[PDB]
C-alpha cells in the first residue's frame, strides 16, 4: 500500500 495512486498511499 505505497503508492500514491488513490491519495497519499504512496507509503
Same mark, same amino acid.
Given at each position: 500500500?505505497?503508492y !500514491? !495512486? +488513490?491519495?497519499?498511499v504512496? +507509503?
Amino acid at each position: 500500500r505505497l503508492y !500514491r !495512486r +488513490r491519495f497519499v498511499v504512496g +507509503r
